Amino acid sequence: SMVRVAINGFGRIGRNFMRCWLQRKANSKLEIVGINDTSDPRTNAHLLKYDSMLGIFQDAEITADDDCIYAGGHAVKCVSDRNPENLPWSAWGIDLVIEATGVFTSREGASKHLSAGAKKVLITAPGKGNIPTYVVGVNHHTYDPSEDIVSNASCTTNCLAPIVKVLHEAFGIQQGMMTTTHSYTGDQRLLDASHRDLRRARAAAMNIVPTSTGAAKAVGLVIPELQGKLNGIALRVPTPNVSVVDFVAQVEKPTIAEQVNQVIKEASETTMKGIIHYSELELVSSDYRGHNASSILDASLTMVLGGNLVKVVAWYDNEWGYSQRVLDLAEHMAAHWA
Amino acid sequence: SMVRVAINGFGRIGRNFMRCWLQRKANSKLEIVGINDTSDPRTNAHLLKYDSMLGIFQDAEITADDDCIYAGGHAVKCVSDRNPENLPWSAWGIDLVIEATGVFTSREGASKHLSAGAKKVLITAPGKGNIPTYVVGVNHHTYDPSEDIVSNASCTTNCLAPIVKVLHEAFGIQQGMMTTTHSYTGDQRLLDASHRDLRRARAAAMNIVPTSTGAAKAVGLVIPELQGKLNGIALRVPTPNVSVVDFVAQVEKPTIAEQVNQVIKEASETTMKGIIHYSELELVSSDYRGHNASSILDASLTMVLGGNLVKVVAWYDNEWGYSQRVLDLAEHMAAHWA
Amino acid sequence: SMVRVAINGFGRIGRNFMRCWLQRKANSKLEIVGINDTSDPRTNAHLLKYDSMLGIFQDAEITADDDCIYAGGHAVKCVSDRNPENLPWSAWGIDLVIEATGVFTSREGASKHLSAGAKKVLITAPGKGNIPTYVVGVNHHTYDPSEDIVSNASCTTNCLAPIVKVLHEAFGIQQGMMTTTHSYTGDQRLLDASHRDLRRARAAAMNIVPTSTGAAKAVGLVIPELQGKLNGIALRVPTPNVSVVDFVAQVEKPTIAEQVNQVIKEASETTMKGIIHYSELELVSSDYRGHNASSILDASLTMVLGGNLVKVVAWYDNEWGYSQRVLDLAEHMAAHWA
Amino acid sequence: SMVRVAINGFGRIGRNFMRCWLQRKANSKLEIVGINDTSDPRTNAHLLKYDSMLGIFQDAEITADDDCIYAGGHAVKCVSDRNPENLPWSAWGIDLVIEATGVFTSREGASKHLSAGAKKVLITAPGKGNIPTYVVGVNHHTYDPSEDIVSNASCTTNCLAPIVKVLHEAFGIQQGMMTTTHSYTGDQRLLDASHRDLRRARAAAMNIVPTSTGAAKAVGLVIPELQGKLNGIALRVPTPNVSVVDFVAQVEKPTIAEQVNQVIKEASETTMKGIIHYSELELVSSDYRGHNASSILDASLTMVLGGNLVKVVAWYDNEWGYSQRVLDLAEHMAAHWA
Amino acid sequence: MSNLEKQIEQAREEAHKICDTEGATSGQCAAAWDALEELQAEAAHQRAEQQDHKTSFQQYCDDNPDAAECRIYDD
Amino acid sequence: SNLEKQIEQAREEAHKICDTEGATSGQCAAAWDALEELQAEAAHQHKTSFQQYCDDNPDAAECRIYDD
């Protein structure tokens, strides 16, 4: 039967994920039946329908009352408890929890959903500690049904790992450095204000803001041969969605820009189809809103120096493309439940 | 014989107030000796020095340890308690508390500072209930030294009420409507996220966001003859500071724009000096950053129809100009300290 | 029969207009066969398809060669001449020119299309001088088919005038002041740079920028009863599209907010359907991207003081809603061609 | 005595340069006596005084008449001629022209100033063709008094080349890749509009916009050994000023992050004082407005992989820091005037 | 160029009229010769740009490097 | 307990002196030397409130860390 899903944390990713599912609802093994969030159903239904980035939801009528959100008659029961141990997962028969709060990313944290009665948790963020991590298109077929807490990594890891896998298999990556020029996200303050991270403290729409990131090191989790060989940083800039990763790698097999592009193009047509999109168009970030690929290679920007130093640049919709991969990973788990 | 001051809430207004006092310290009756905030002192000192809007504080060094921030060798004791009843105000000898958290604007909430040992509270916001409300230059001479909780009203009320007082005494205001096209504030959301106000929930740097405001009704508190005769709204737009109020009033004595402007110019040079500034320049919001006036009349924009329908437009730096008034009100309380 | 249309100026309005017609192509007596613009067909096909505000055009495939843009296989010939006297209107059989350059809005300029061979010109702006001016839904039925040059007024006049018409008929407008809080436009500067208007000189995405405007006065052109009774100003703010009019009127028949709203709501359901939309939803500017109506009354913001001073607030997509009205007027002209 | 300077193009760099000189006018061998620009003296004076980025100039009063700008009494004559051949450099006795229009960057174009009668021209941009290029602190001591046309290179070249010279001399740069996450500049359209470059055509404040750039290759003009060994790209993001360069080099001598930072710290206290600044603070872009260094290394971001793959990150105020360097180069030409 | 050639013909006729009336070496004659020569020069500019398969938009950008459509700032 | 009272004072004195006299000043050196002499006793013998607040409220705006 259907795998019954609850979303914990109805934020940018939780609502993008919900709209992703509503659009692919016809062919899906998932049934979203519950939401837990810090807010009430009428507020969350309003935010689900009226999205500054995705526009107004057109497909189904969206309604709410005190206990439920309705998306085309389809009823999603709602609850609001900040402690996942108190959630009615047993009573609602929840199989899979989409952990999108950004708060329960350790095994201890995410397991509170298991104590409440859910069978499995999919964290929409890197895991803390030893939590199996998956990037669809890179290693998601290695998923073992007996893993009941998994991570879908971060949005930057989902964009970078597919490209890194293609380039490593074709040229042999020895070391690699990354910078993501990233839309601001909800962890940054709107105006300068209290924060444990002195850079996230600063007004997000007025600044280029560097942050440290594990997104490049995390590629070594889904491509284990590259563990310890990748590092990088993030630069948040005043756009609300869509990001771009700049990757510079030392490779073993000498090459040129045309060969790097041709390799990624061929992968986009075959082993990475639907994961990498290869573009030779001169577009900008707004054009990649709602793009379903995890990575869009901007082929015009590829350059190589001395045969072995390779730079590639790839776009990604960090909200919508990532939520599409969350949906993909959950569908994979449903098809491999036991 | 100086009044010992603590700041509750070291946010935009708390820190703008601190930097106002640091510049005016040589002529002040106040000594700021204490801060309470969510943050630790090392976070607070970093944000006091490095301000995306005000720039890097230049006049003296700013450091911190675990217990204090230091501004030019002047130590300011710090604490992090979110319940004001627990605060060491008796131990620190605190006379006046600047209440700038935004969450203790009722008499009951503000009064928690008193039972912790403070003598008076100045709320940097409208008061909820029966709290005396003052606008410097409008009614601050009616301050009664026996009052222990006062409100300095809002930034919009501080801009509007001086112009309304001058217009009323010149022409007789019968009714008046207001719209403040207002920089976004920390009360709004960077990206679509839950909020008690469904409009303030929406991405603040990507939207024009209508919100309601009592600021025009609040003018009725400090000009009692106009109680019930003023109303309006706010339009929050994607600038981080500086706002502009548009006021349309039915007046009793027929006039023309040139005379409206002359009346306000004469008051800005006499009875409202330092409060209202009269401007005939063609400027934009950036140019009014750091302006010390409560209201800067943009005289080129004034218009009148049929004698009795008057429109005026005034700028205000809602962080810095308002903080200048908070300090003015505090200095006045200090000069009438009984 | 079909009226052969050329677009002069393939900018924001010209390309929005093109996408409006492409979506209404099956129910249209217009045929867009020509474009004149600064850039070549390949550049203009790219910008028509990839729009930072409207997203990627989905309905029809867009391609181009050296001579033409192809939309759905329908060929649109392109030329690049800055002087309309030289354009091949006679050779191409053009009946109607959409004048959307912003450069030929006077009879001297617009008539150059006539000597070039076109039969009628529709200016997508206020016409200078004695050019008959129309707002669809207000006075477009006074169109005389013998007119060779017509104006569709400005975007703000198209927002204000339908609401003014409904309010005037129900309550009697004596006078009225308007402020539009308006998205920036191509006439402003990205960074402080030379400009005849010293406020439009200033960095548009950084500032609130006041400018004078003809838009409220221009209502008197399409509602002659009210000539000389309306005035107002603009505030340009850092959003790239969608604007809001704030209108304060003195009315003869005393009323209350609920009755003001019911009157506009009733007009939106009857004679003004598709021109005025009545909204009780708590929305923000992003939510009105792509709205087809000239005016969306924000009913929650309606207020009345003393019975005779009325404030109403109306949204409008200044690019797309305006271009829908340009299309509407062109369709009206084609239905009454002579 | 003192060199008579005229500015051609009173834009962002032209006006930043003028304000740089007014602050350092006491110790200077340059007298700015003339301006040529597309705008009139009064417009030029208003934009010089009222700067969205720099704030209001307060050192001296600025006024204007039909012919001059006046800054603290000292007069600057103005003219408006697009064609430098007609410029009155003869009559005005102009010795050195600051060429900041962006359009006369070739030897043919820049020499037109010499026809009009100036001795030397300093281009505030990369030269087209073999014009000698200088970066202060890197190679400005190779300037020959016999050169009449010179380039100060780009702002990104001025940031990157001092850092490259340090790392090259300390570790030996074999190859190098750069990405500058760059504030938007006046060559980008405010809204989607005609442009010869399809990426610069797109709304600058809405988008992350990649552009090809010669700035990294041009490091090879000022460090000849690295010719053909450096390359990179630019990403324009929605900030109005201040940029950051991300540099990944393959180096010959194996090192670690701590050693890279120490090498750059020591160089900034010795051979590169005033050119490179070393920061270990966690700041954001706003904090670097008005910084006088060509490069501010963000030491927190430095990382090394495998001994030989080095990443460094450096801030630069692309308007103000670059203009300080323009002035430095001009004073050097004046001190060695032959 | 068919339109431009009509401008060259009108500019040649007026140049000859001005120069034969106001003087072969006068200011009006030198100026009218300027109009004709500038037009002839751009008739050759536009002609050499057409054989490069260069669009009229690119000819505009070569004649107007300062225009908002043509600025390339190498950041 | 009573000796960390002294250390607290000595730290405030070192911050006040170094910020007004300069990090490279003899006065700043004397102030810090007085502090180190007192922390030498701490060898003979924690979470801040902000940190504990982020432990309890990791969803609060002050505490969010999204790995972009």
Ligand SMILES: NC(=O)c1ccc[n+]([C@@H]2O[C@H](COP(=O)([O-])OP(=O)(O)OC[C@H]3O[C@@H](n4cnc5c(N)ncnc54)[C@H](O)[C@@H]3O)[C@@H](O)[C@H]2O)c1
């Ligand atoms: N935004 C992106 O681009 C993006 C992309 C990929 C992954 N992520 C990751 O996904 C996670 C969510 O990020 P987001 O952008 O959606 O953030 P968000 O702040 O918009 O959403 C978080 C939601 O969870 C709710 N919440 C917080 N604590 C809760 C609790 N204890 N119980 C129930 N609900 C709670 C919040 O109210 C909010 O609705 C983060 O870990 C982030 O790193 C974000």
Ligand SMILES: NC(=O)c1ccc[n+]([C@@H]2O[C@H](COP(=O)([O-])OP(=O)(O)OC[C@H]3O[C@@H](n4cnc5c(N)ncnc54)[C@H](O)[C@@H]3O)[C@@H](O)[C@H]2O)c1
């Ligand atoms: N920003 C303006 O333009 C402006 C102008 C006039 C008045 N005000 C008013 O000033 C007040 C503060 O606004 P702001 O813009 O400075 O907001 P802010 O969010 O920048 O500052 C509030 C500060 O108080 C702290 N705080 C919150 N709860 C607390 C608690 N229980 N105990 C101790 N500290 C706590 C926050 O961490 C923050 O540092 C509000 O009442 C607001 O309406 C703001």
Ligand SMILES: NC(=O)c1ccc[n+]([C@@H]2O[C@H](COP(=O)([O-])OP(=O)(O)OC[C@H]3O[C@@H](n4cnc5c(N)ncnc54)[C@H](O)[C@@H]3O)[C@@H](O)[C@H]2O)c1
């Ligand atoms: N943007 C709005 O919100 C809006 C709304 C209503 C009306 N309008 C009016 O519509 C007109 C166009 O506005 P816009 O925002 O589209 O400006 P725009 O700058 O985006 O469009 C102008 C277009 O015409 C081209 N052009 C300029 N001069 C030309 C010439 N001589 N020959 C041929 N093409 C030429 C330009 O290169 C550009 O593509 C203006 O009159 C404006 O006032 C604009």
Ligand SMILES: NC(=O)c1ccc[n+]([C@@H]2O[C@H](COP(=O)([O-])OP(=O)(O)OC[C@H]3O[C@@H](n4cnc5c(N)ncnc54)[C@H](O)[C@@H]3O)[C@@H](O)[C@H]2O)c1
């Ligand atoms: N802005 C930066 O960050 C920066 C940094 C380094 C170098 N530069 C370079 O400096 C140059 C100027 O850039 P900007 O940002 O000041 O651009 P800008 O557009 O602000 O300035 C150009 C100025 O020159 C004027 N102008 C144009 N054509 C002219 C002509 N024919 N005669 C006289 N005046 C003319 C313009 O009206 C404008 O005032 C460009 O080459 C740019 O690449 C810019």
